[PDB]
Symmetry: D2
């Protein structure tokens, strides 16, 4: 289970889609 | 942004998510 | 937060992606 | 399969997920 941001390559477990989506609200 | 599973470590583009699901439908 | 299966239109909160993906392992 | 958010009830195809994220980047 994993998700990785495109510009900065940060880790987020798949069951944490809300966390990941909150990371792409803020800029990186 | 990437999609990665912790069964085989295959990566997937995020927009290509329906491909990630076809892979997860069946075991690896 | 929501996900809906294509063939049978079942509900899954977005923070439950693992549940949804397990529903498309089994057939409906 | 559909993507739906509980802020405005906009639906999205699942394969078109990167569009759902662009919508969630900004408030509604
Ligand atoms: Zn990032
Ligand atoms: Zn795999
Ligand atoms: Zn179903
Ligand atoms: Zn919305």
């Amino acid at each position: 289970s994993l998700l990785t941001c495109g510009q900065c390559q940060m880790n987020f477990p798949l069951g944490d889609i809300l966390i990941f989506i909150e990371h792409k609200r803020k800029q990186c």
